[PDB]
Amino acid sequence: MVHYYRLSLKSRQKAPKIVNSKYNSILNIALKNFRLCKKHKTKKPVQILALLQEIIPKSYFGTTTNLKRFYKVVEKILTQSSFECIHLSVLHKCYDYDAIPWLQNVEPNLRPKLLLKHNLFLLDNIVKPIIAFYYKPIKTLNGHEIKFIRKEEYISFESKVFHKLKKMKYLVEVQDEVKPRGVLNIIPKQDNFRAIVSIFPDSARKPFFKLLTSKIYKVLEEKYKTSGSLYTCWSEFTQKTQGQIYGIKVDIRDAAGNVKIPVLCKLIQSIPTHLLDSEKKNFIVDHISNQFVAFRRKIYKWNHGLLQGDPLSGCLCELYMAFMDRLYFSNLDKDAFIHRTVDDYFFCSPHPHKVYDFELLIKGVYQVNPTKTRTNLPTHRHPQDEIPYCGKIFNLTTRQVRTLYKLPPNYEIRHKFKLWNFNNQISDDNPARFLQKAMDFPFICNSFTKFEFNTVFNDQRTVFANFYDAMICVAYKFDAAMMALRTSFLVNDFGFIWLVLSSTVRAYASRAFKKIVTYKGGKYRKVTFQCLKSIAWRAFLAVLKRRTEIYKGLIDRIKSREKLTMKFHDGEVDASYFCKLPEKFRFVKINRKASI
DNA sequence: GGTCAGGTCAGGTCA
Ligand SMILES: [Mg+2]
Ligand SMILES: [Mg+2]
Instruction: Work out if A45's Cβ lies within 7 angstroms of strand B.
Output: no
CB A300 within 8 A of CB A172: yes
Instruction: Work out if A440's Cβ lies within 7 angstroms of strand B.
Output: yes
| Resolution in angstrom units | 3.6
Instruction: Work out if A404's Cβ lies within 7 angstroms of strand B.
Output: yes
Q: What is the CATH code of the structural domain delimited by A151-202+290-309?
A: 3.10.10.20
Q: A510's torsion region: left (phi>0), alpha (psi -120 to 50) or beta?
A: alpha
The nucleotide minimizing the C1' distance to residue A416's CA is: B12
Element (H, E) at A431: helix A431-438
The nucleotide minimizing the C1' distance to residue A388's CA is: B14
Closest CA to A452 of A516, A537, A399: A516
Q: Give distance CA A460 / C1' B15 (Å).
A: 31
The nucleotide minimizing the C1' distance to residue A440's CA is: B11
d(CA A480, CA A487): 11
Query: Contacts by A88-91 with C-beta closer than 8 Å and gap 24+?
Result: A88/A2, A88/A3, A88/A4, A88/A5, A88/A116, A88/A428, A89/A3, A89/A428, A89/A488, A90/A487, A90/A488, A90/A490, A91/A5, A91/A115, A91/A116, A91/A119, A91/A120
Residue A83 CA to ligand 2 center (angstroms) comes to 20
CB A392 within 8 A of CB A403: yes
Q: A258's torsion region: left (phi>0), alpha (psi -120 to 50) or beta?
A: alpha
Eight-state DSSP code of residue A142: S
Residues making up chain A, counted from first to last: 596
Q: Give distance CA A114 / C1' B4 (Å).
A: 54
Q: Which residues contact residue A286 at a Cβ distance below 8 angstroms, ignoring those fewer than 6 apart?
A: none
Intrachain domains A1-150 and A226-258+335-407 with the same fold: no
The nucleotide minimizing the C1' distance to residue A419's CA is: B11
Q: How many CA atoms lie within 13 A of A585 on its CB side?
A: 26
The nucleotide minimizing the C1' distance to residue A480's CA is: B11
Q: Give distance CA A374 / C1' B6 (Å).
A: 45
Q: Alpha-carbon dihedral of residues A83, A87, A90, A92, nearest 10 degrees?
A: 120
Instruction: Work out if A439's Cβ lies within 7 angstroms of strand B.
Output: no
CB A376 within 8 A of CB A396: yes
Query: Contacts by A316-321 with C-beta closer than 8 Å and gap 24+?
Result: A316/A216, A316/A259, A316/A264, A316/A288, A317/A255, A317/A256, A317/A259, A317/A342, A317/A343, A318/A217, A318/A220, A318/A342, A319/A216, A319/A219, A319/A220, A319/A264, A319/A267, A320/A259, A320/A263, A320/A264, A320/A267, A321/A255
Question: Hey, which CATH number is domain A203-225+259-289+310-334, 3.30.342.10, 1.10.20.10, 1.10.10.2210, 3.40.50.720?
Answer: 1.10.10.2210
Ligand nearest to the CA of A201: 1
User: Does the CA dihedral A296-A297-A298-A301 come out positive or negative?
Assistant: positive
d(CA A321, CA A254): 12
Which CATH architecture describes the domain A226-258+335-407? 2-Layer Sandwich (3.30)
Instruction: Work out if A423's Cβ lies within 7 angstroms of strand B.
Output: yes
The nucleotide minimizing the C1' distance to residue A343's CA is: B15
d(CA A416, CA A252): 27
Instruction: Work out if A183's Cβ lies within 7 angstroms of strand B.
Output: no
What does each C-alpha distance from A494 to A126, A482, A489, A503, A553 come to in angstroms? 37, 10, 12, 16, 10
Three-state secondary structure along A267-303? HHHHCCCCCCCHHHHHHHHHHHHCCEEECCCCEEEEC
Give the class (CATH, top level) of A408-596. Answer: mainly alpha
Closest CA to A81 of A477, A485, A416, A410: A416
Q: Tell me which nucleotides of strand B come within 7 A of a protein CB.
A: 9-15
CB A96 within 8 A of CB A65: yes
Q: Which residues contact residue A100 at a Cβ distance below 8 angstroms, ignoring those fewer than 6 apart?
A: A60, A61, A62, A63, A66, A115
d(CA A111, CA A97): 8
Instruction: Work out if A417's Cβ lies within 7 angstroms of strand B.
Output: yes
What does each C-alpha distance from A334 to A125, A239, A329, A348 come to in angstroms? 65, 13, 12, 11
Q: Give distance CA A552 / C1' B3 (Å).
A: 49
d(CA A175, CA A406): 44
Closest CA to A346 of A398, A394, A299, A380: A394
Instruction: Work out if A305's Cβ lies within 7 angstroms of strand B.
Output: no
Residue A87 CA to ligand 2 center (angstroms) comes to 31
Within A7-150, residue ranges assigned H as helices are: 26-38, 48-53, 64-78, 111-122, 128-134
d(CA A417, CA A435): 13
Instruction: Work out if A178's Cβ lies within 7 angstroms of strand B.
Output: no
Q: Which residues contact residue A252 at a Cβ distance below 8 angstroms, ignoring those fewer than 6 apart?
A: A258, A343, A344, A345, A362, A366, A367, A368, A369
CB A139 within 8 A of CB A64: no
Angle at the Cα of A434 from the Cα atoms of A430 and A437, rounded to 5 degrees: 140
d(CA A251, CA A249): 7
d(CA A208, CA A287): 13
Q: How many helices (H) and strands (E) are present in chain A, helices listed first?
A: 20, 16
Residue A374 CA to ligand 2 center (angstroms) comes to 34
Residue A212 CA to ligand 2 center (angstroms) comes to 12
d(CA A169, CA A593): 44
Residue A180 CA to ligand 2 center (angstroms) comes to 23
Domain ranges of chain A: 1-150, 151-202+290-309, 203-225+259-289+310-334, 226-258+335-407, 408-596
Strand B contacts in A 307-326 (CB under 7 A): 314
How would you classify the pairing of strands A299-302 and A192-199? unpaired
Q: What fold is seen in the domain A1-150?
A: Topoisomerase I; Chain A, domain 4 (1.10.132)
